[PDB]
RNA sequence: AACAAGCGAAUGAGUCAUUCAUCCUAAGUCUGCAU
RNA sequence: AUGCAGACUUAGGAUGAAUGACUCAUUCGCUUGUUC
């Protein structure tokens, strides 16, 4: 319901490029351009694709106008590189001429050329938005090739004056005529010959009885060349997303359909059928461009002014991009990243701004700072969200200039100017709307988690380029409250050096002989050390709240960078074992920091004695783990060394973590990622699919829990006591998975449920109650190409149950007709439900 | 890779609901103990 | 009053799983219309 929560779908509006922006359309004189060259080559050395020259009016951004893209065709790859070229100059002649290639074979082949007659006869300009043109056009292979378009100029000229065989447009030799671009007059589509009927004419068999029938009665038009063979032509399709690799290199191997008009229904281009092998590749080529460059632009208004640093368009472009759009990349690790920098940074200005506020204000002035709701708001201020890239990426909708757009998205969202702003009627709780998906004014559904994702993955991404300065760059430039202001970090070491340090029995001598470190200051330390039961004026709970941030972020810095194909979600199990608080109890025990906690509270003594007794001499070498959980204090004391290992080094990182990557030696990566036994149990009970009762409680001092877990034909139950009974549940849990990984008419059904997940929905969370495992389907289906109360399909999925019911034997049933296949399961589980109560097992009522 | 649509499926997401979890941080109440 | 402990709940960040339903992308089978 908050900004930033997951919940709220927001609109938001689409940022334009504002180098696509080009005020060239509609000149008296012919305008100036800087070309970029589109060179395609594919991995198959058999076919070519045409090179191409964007011509826009503004020069690109020179991380987005040298670029090299990736195509995923079908079954090939086609590498793009978006070389730069010169300065080109184009007369009026010669802009009319361009204008005509691009918006002809783009109206040709993607939109609908003859509109009902023929598109470039009616009125254009219309088509070519000023928000969007950039003329691009052929290459003759940096050149311009003429040929090519002054082809299709001619061939524009006369479809709006509208041995060898004739075409409409001109005669052709009947053997050099193979595989040529040509299009048909009488439907306005551009098809590629690629064979004349050796045997074959206007007489050959087609409701209709033949060709010249066929073109009598459908457009009545009498084909005065009978006798010359008809052609079949493979047709124009439509532009396929070629920007990710959707087939994994599922799709076989599909036929060409080929389409047979008689030669004199066609019209002879000279442009060659590289250029239009080449044009399917453009709508994903500028589609790419179009998204480096409001990536280049974010850039831009970002700046930096650091003479050291750089950041590319493809992670700005990675930083904006929401994983709602599938694409090789998708921010979620940048937004990981981002969140632990941000946290980073505000704890330590929290921590360096106010010396008096303890571990609770600054923490919730860190949860002020930090949020997804204060991000969000920083975000969209910022206008940030115009360039998050949250879109599937249609390519059947995107339309060169000059295109019609057969498909338009009207904008219905009430909103009249471009950048919407935000109020409420923009925001939205309900399901059914569609996250992603612009209108033709560039407005779309972002989830704005995503918005508050993109300022975290921006702010990852200037750590991940610039360091820690360019990522506090983009923090301040979104407007987050850190400075950081270098004298005031030299200003807590005088709040150190006025303290007397008190190094009384060289105590710190030995603890940093326990972690190879210096300290030139030794009173961080001894308050690092300092517990609250001491009752000083110091105490670590302000430095652990520090290194808290700080072995949060060294770690996730650690997992990001080392493991490059994971995302989130593996980078948190894996964090969650690094700075896991127990992980940093048994890394104060390994390392011994423990002797140095300095404490005066008995119970805190006794906790510590019972953690060290805990720890058993392993099986084989690996590590002393320990038998119980031990206190928070412990690894309290970790995170406050490394607080106090930051503002003794004056914030230097990689001086904080090259004394604490040999802490933790034993880095937990993801073959070594064991997750806490709670959830590796209910997770392998729910992936196999069975199901356990719990229960805890507080019997002595020491907490109890049993789990009852139901295999096929067993009941067995897994027990464990532990203080915290979360961990009596892990004991429990870790129990119940080695006796496991060994091993590997009175109920009431309820009121049966509707709407298609209803019946399996009460079964399931009867099986979870009443415990049973999860009935397993067998569907079956009779398809059939004629239609199967009902509503119409194809297939009629008859499906069968069965539910190991425990302690009983098995029963298989079935679903008498369902065209869905999630229905058929559905009724099945119904006629289950009442066949059961037939069988004296559950009762619907 | 003819095109649009509808229907069915498969796969990967996202999101919601349900009911459960993990990890870090703060806090409140209740219960217990003790100084 | 303070400390500790546990239950519960909330707030903040990062998350994950079963089930159920949408939605999207990709892909396939069919159907109709269109192209043929
Ligand atoms: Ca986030
Ligand atoms: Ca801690
Ligand atoms: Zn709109």
Redesign the pocket.
Same mark, same amino acid.
């Given at each position: 319901s908050?900004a930033?929560?997951?919940?709220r779908?927001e609109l938001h509006g689409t940022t334009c490029a504002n180098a696509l922006s080009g005020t060239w359309g509609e000149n008296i004189d012919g305008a100036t351009f800087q070309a970029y060259k589109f060179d395609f080559c594919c991995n198959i050395s058999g076919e070519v694709y045409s090179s191409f020259s964007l011509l826009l009016e503004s020069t690109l951004a020179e991380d987005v106008g040298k670029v090299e893209m990736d195509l995923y065709?079908?079954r090939?790859l086609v590498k793009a590189s978006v070389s730069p070229c010169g300065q080109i100059r184009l007369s009026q002649e010669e802009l009319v001429k361009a204008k005509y290639f691009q918006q002809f074979f783009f109206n040709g082949m993607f939109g609908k050329l003859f509109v009902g007659e023929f598109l470039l006869q009616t009125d254009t300009s219309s088509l070519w938005h000023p928000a969007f043109m950039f003329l691009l056009l052929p290459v003759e292979t940096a050149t311009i090739d003429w040929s090519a378009i002054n082809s299709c100029a001619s061939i524009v000229e006369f479809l709006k004056k509208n041995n060898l065989i004739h075409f409409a447009n001109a005669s052709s030799d009947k053997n050099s005529l193979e595989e040529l671009v040509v299009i048909?007059i009488?439907?306005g589509?551009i098809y590629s010959i690629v064979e004349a009927v050796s045997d074959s004419s206007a007489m050959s068999p087609?409701?209709?009885a033949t060709?010249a029938e066929?073109?009598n009665k459908?457009?009545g038009i009498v084909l005065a060349h009978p006798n010359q063979p #008809?052609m079949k032509l493979?047709?124009?399709?439509?532009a396929?997303?070629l920007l990710?690799d959707?087939?994994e290199e599922? @799709?076989?191997r599909?036929?060409?359909?080929?389409?047979?008009?008689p030669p004199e229904?066609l019209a002879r281009i000279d442009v060659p059928r590289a250029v239009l092998?080449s044009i399917?590749l453009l709508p994903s080529v500028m589609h790419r461009l179009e998204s480096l460059m409001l990536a280049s632009q974010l850039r831009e208004e970002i700046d930096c002014s650091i003479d050291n640093f750089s950041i590319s368009s493809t992670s700005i472009l990675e930083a904006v991009t929401?994983?709602?759009c599938?694409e090789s990349f998708?921010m979620?690790r940048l937004?990981?990243l981002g969140?632990?920098v941000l946290?980073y940074v505000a704890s330590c200005h929290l921590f360096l701004k106010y010396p008096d506020k303890?571990?609770?204000?600054?923490?919730?002035q860190?949860?002020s700072i930090?949020?997804?709701?204060? #991000?969000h708001r920083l975000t969209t201020s910022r206008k940030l969200q115009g360039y998050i890239r949250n879109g599937?990426?249609?390519? @059947?909708r995107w339309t060169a200039p000059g295109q019609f757009s057969?498909?338009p998205v009207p904008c219905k969202c009430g909103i009249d100017t471009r950048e919407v702003p935000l109020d409420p009627k923009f925001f939205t709780?309900?399901?059914?709307?569609?996250?992603?998906?612009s209108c033709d004014m560039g407005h779309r559904w972002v989830?704005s988690?995503?918005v508050?994702?993109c300022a975290?993955a921006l702010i990852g991404a200037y750590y991940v380029s610039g360091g820690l300065s360019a990522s506090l760059h983009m923090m301040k430039w979104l407007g987050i409250d850190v400075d950081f202001d270098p004298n005031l970090v030299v200003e807590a070491i005088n709040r150190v050096s006025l303290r007397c340090y008190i190094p009384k029995e060289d105590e710190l001598i030995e603890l940093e002989r326990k972690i190879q470190h210096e300290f030139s200051a030794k009173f961080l330390l001894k308050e690092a050390i300092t517990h609250?039961?001491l009752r000083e004026s110091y105490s670590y709970?302000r430095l652990?709240?520090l290194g808290?941030?700080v072995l949060?972020f060294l770690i996730?810095r650690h997992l990001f960078n080392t493991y490059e194909q994971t995302?989130?979600?593996?980078?948190?199990?894996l964090?969650?074992?690094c700075?896991?608080?127990?992980?940093?109890a048994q890394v104060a025990v390994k390392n011994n920091l423990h002797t140095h906690l300095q404490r005066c509270?008995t119970?805190?003594e006794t906790?510590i004695n019972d953690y060290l007794m805990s720890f058993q001499k392993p099986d084989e070498t690996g590590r002393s783990i320990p038998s119980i959980?031990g206190?928070?204090?412990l690894?309290?004391v970790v995170?406050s060394i490394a607080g106090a290992l930051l503002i003794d080094t004056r914030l230097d990182l990689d001086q904080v973590w090259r004394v604490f990557e040999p802490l933790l030696s034993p880095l937990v990566t993801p073959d070594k990622l064991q997750?806490?036994p709670?959830?590796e149990l209910?997770?392998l009970c729910?992936?196999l699919?069975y199901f356990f009762r719990?229960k805890?409680s507080?019997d002595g001092?020491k907490?109890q829990a049993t789990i009852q877990l139901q295999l096929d034909d067993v009941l067995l139950t897994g027990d464990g006591s532990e203080?915290?009974?979360?961990?009596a549940?892990?004991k429990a849990a870790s129990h119940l998975l080695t006796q496991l990984e060994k091993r590997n008419v009175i109920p009431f059904i309820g009121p049966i449920n509707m709407?298609?997940?209803?019946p399996?929905?009460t079964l399931?969370?009867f099986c979870?109650k009443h415990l049973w495992p999860?009935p397993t389907?067998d569907?079956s289906?009779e398809?059939?190409?004629?239609?199967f109360e009902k509503?119409?399909?194809?297939?009629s999925?008859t499906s069968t149950i069965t539910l190991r019911i425990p302690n009983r034997e098995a029963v298989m049933y079935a679903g008498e007709a369902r065209?869905?296949?999630?229905?058929?399961?559905?009724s099945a589980v119904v006629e289950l439900l009442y066949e059961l109560e037939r069988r004296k097992i559950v009762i619907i009522q």
């Open positions: 908050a930033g929560s997951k919940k779908k065709l079908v090939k048909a009488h439907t589509r087609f409701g209709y060709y066929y073109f459908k457009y #008809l493979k047709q124009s399709h439509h396929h997303n990710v959707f087939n599922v @799709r076989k599909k036929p060409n359909i080929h389409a047979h008009l229904l092998k399917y929401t994983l709602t599938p998708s979620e937004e990981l969140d632990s946290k303890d571990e609770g204000q600054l923490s919730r860190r949860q930090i949020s997804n709701s204060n #991000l599937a990426f249609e390519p @059947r057969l498909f709780e309900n399901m059914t709307i569609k996250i992603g998906k989830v988690k995503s508050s994702d975290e609250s039961s709970e652990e709240f808290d941030s949060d996730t995302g989130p979600g593996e980078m948190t199990d964090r969650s074992a700075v896991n608080n127990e992980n940093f509270a119970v805190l906790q959980q206190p928070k204090a690894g309290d995170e997750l806490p709670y959830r209910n997770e729910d992936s699919g719990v805890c507080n001092v907490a203080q915290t009974n979360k961990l549940l892990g709407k298609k997940g209803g399996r929905g399931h969370e979870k999860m389907f569907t289906e398809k059939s190409r004629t239609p509503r119409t399909s194809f297939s999925f065209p869905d296949k999630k229905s058929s399961f559905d």
